[PDB]
């Protein structure tokens, strides 16, 4: 019963900030790492970063 | 072939002895309620050892089938068994001789002790 749930978002003006999130279950939250990735229509895939929910620290692509 | 227990069971003695190694071996295979799992396992072990020790006391520790020198008599059960040995079979037999097990075991102990004394005297005279 592993599931991930995401909320939607609006269109922002340039210079603005956005907050997005993801809820997950079916596995202990603090027992694994989570990744965020990005892709735009017509483009390939990029990796953005990793967060360790156990603690914790982060690491990001430059 | 795993026959579990009591596979034969309905057979003649003939015939039934063919599986003595099956029942002999399947006998050793074994939150606070778990205390009972340990108690059950301890009981299985203690019961096994008591029977194994008794065969040793009678001189039959190494065998499933053992022949001794206590004579059979008519003060016990009364069957000629020329056919009945191979037609009765085991449950009925124990019921027929149920009043003598406490007697026969006593004879088996006496016979083995006498033989042990005889062996010691014969070796001493070597």
């Amino acid at each position: 019963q592993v599931q991930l749930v995401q909320s939607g978002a609006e269109v922002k003006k340039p210079g603005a900030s956005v907050k997005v999130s993801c809820k997950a279950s079916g596995y202990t939250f603090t027992s694994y790492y989570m990744h965020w990735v990005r892709q735009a229509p017509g483009q390939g895939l990029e990796w953005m970063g990793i967060i360790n929910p156990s603690g914790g620290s982060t690491s990001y692509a430059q | 072939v795993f026959l579990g227990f009591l596979g034969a069971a309905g057979s003649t003695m003939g015939a039934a002895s063919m599986t003595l190694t099956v029942q002999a071996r399947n006998l050793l295979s074994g939150t606070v309620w778990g205390i009972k799992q340990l108690q059950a396992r301890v009981l299985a072990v203690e019961r096994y050892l008591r029977d194994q020790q008794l065969l040793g006391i009678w001189g039959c520790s190494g065998k499933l089938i053992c022949c001794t020198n206590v004579p059979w008599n008519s003060s016990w059960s009364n069957r000629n068994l020329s056919e009945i040995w191979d037609n009765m079979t085991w449950l009925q037999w124990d019921k027929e001789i149920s009043n003598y097990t406490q007697i026969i075991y006593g004879l088996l102990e006496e016979s083995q002790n006498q033989q042990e004394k005889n062996e010691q005297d014969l070796l001493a005279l070597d």
Binding site: G55, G56, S57, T58, S59 | -
Partner: protein, 452 residues
């Protein structure tokens, strides 16, 4: 020719297996009649004798990343910490609205939230209450989500906070492990062993030496030292790894202190219950700190870099300070004197290296905390009474827990990591494997059995 089957019993053959290991302890008892220590370690058979047998011509594979005993060390440590609070007073009656003005604070380190924090407590007869106050350290006090004059204990609206009994204060006790009959523990006598592959010097013991249940992040302290040079242990599948373990062959002494002097006070709760908190503080104010020798710190890191580049044999090495997270993962955490310290180590890892003793003391600044959400669990917070007077503490530094990150260029970037208590225990249990013995087997022989 004319071979027949013969059977042997007592053959020296073994297989890897998962089992239950038992603790063993030292000759001296705790002697406090404490169920989580005296009845847990002091009543354990003592002084097992490690009469190691060295085996000629035996080769065996030792995997220190994956084994069946690190997890047991983890469970034993958790069990003790849960049991230690079993008979101790809960602080539920204390989770009341606090009125802490810090009107009498004499320092910026105090006035943030510590002095005369008051409360209304009902005691001892249920019928009457009195106004009491005490000193609490600021990291454990939070503003009530209302008027700024009102305060709450940091964890009391979500979990239970309990205090500790003086008798259960727990310092390290080395725990030795022993195998049950039918099992044996093998050691790998290889001074250059990195945690994987075969060892050509195999020996067995009836017990391991003792390992202390010490918990820290970033730095490994009080442990054994490497026999040769610094050994860096890592995984060898992908380079995307979680932990790099650096084991030093020389210790670095670290001296820490809490220079002020505290008065202990006590607020009664009831019939055998009292809350311990800080009273008058003596007498001037100095921050907690730790001292490190400069030449040893720099030499040690240069030597670590020299070996670290073996795993990354290309461009240079850069170290960086903590990037974020809660305090246990960003500061150096330890419990000297029974109080918990959170030292800022960000000044210590700003060095860069490139291809081609008691002097100039390096000092760092430390903070302390009383309510600890321990590494072992959530929902059950432990409090801690203040220790009266000042605190002094000396220990030895034996290793580092490092992780990796992205640099701004083509060089490698490393920084302190931690929180995985298993990586502390895995740094000492790397030498042991447990196997089972299966003594029955067959072989051919020039022998037949007589029928007669």
């Amino acid at each position: 020719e004319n071979l027949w089957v013969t059977v042997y019993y007592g053959v020296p053959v073994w297989k890897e297996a998962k089992t239950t290991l038992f603790c063993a302890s030292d000759a001296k008892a705790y002697e406090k009649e404490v169920h989580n220590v005296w009845a847990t370690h002091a009543c354990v058979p003592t002084d097992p004798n490690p009469q190691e047998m060295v085996l000629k011509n035996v080769t065996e594979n030792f995997n220190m990343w994956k084994n069946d005993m690190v997890d047991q060390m983890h469970e034993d440590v958790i069990s003790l910490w849960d049991q230690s609070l079993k008979p101790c007073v809960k602080l539920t009656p204390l989770c009341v609205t606090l009125n802490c003005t810090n009107a009498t604070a004499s320092n910026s380190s105090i006035i943030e939230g510590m002095k005369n924090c008051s409360f209304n407590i009902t005691t001892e007869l249920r019928d009457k209450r009195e106004k009491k106050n005490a000193l609490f350290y600021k990291l454990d006090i939070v503003q009530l989500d209302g008027n700024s004059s009102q305060y709450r204990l940091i964890n009391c609206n979500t979990s239970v906070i309990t205090q500790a009994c003086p008798k259960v204060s727990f310092d390290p006790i080395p725990i030795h492990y022993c195998a049950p009959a039918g099992y044996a523990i093998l050691k790998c006598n290889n001074k250059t062993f990195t945690g994987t592959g075969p060892c050509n010097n195999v020996s067995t013991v009836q017990c391991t030496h003792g390992i202390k249940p010490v918990v820290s992040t970033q730095l490994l302290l009080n442990g054994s030292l490497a026999e040769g040079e610094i050994i860096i242990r890592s995984e060898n599948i992908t380079k995307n790894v979680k932990t790099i373990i650096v084991h030093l062959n020389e210790s670095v002494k670290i001296e820490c202190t809490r220079p002020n002097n505290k008065t202990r006070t006590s607020i009664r709760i009831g019939p055998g219950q009292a809350f311990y908190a800080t009273g008058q503080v003596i007498g001037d104010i100095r921050e907690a700190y730790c001292n490190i020798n400069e030449s040893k710190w720099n030499e040690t890191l240069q030597r670590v870099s020299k070996k670290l580049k073996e795993y990354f044999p290309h461009k240079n090495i850069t170290f960086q300070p903590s990037s974020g997270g809660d305090l246990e993962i960003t500061t150096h955490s330890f419990n000297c004197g029974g109080e918990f310290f959170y030292c800022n180590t960000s000044s210590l890892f700003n060095r860069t290296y490139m291809a081609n003793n008691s002097t100039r003391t390096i000092t760092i600044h430390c903070r302390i905390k009383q309510i600890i959400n321990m590494w072992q669990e959530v929902g059950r917070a432990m409090y801690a009474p203040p220790i009266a007077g000042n605190i002094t503490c000396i220990s030895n530094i034996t290793g580092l827990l490092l992780t990796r990150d992205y640099g701004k260029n083509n060089t490698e970037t490393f920084r302190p990591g931690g929180g995985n208590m298993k990586d502390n225990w895995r740094s000492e249990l790397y030498k042991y494997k447990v196997v089972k013995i299966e003594p029955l087997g067959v072989a051919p022989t020039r022998c037949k059995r007589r029928v007669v």
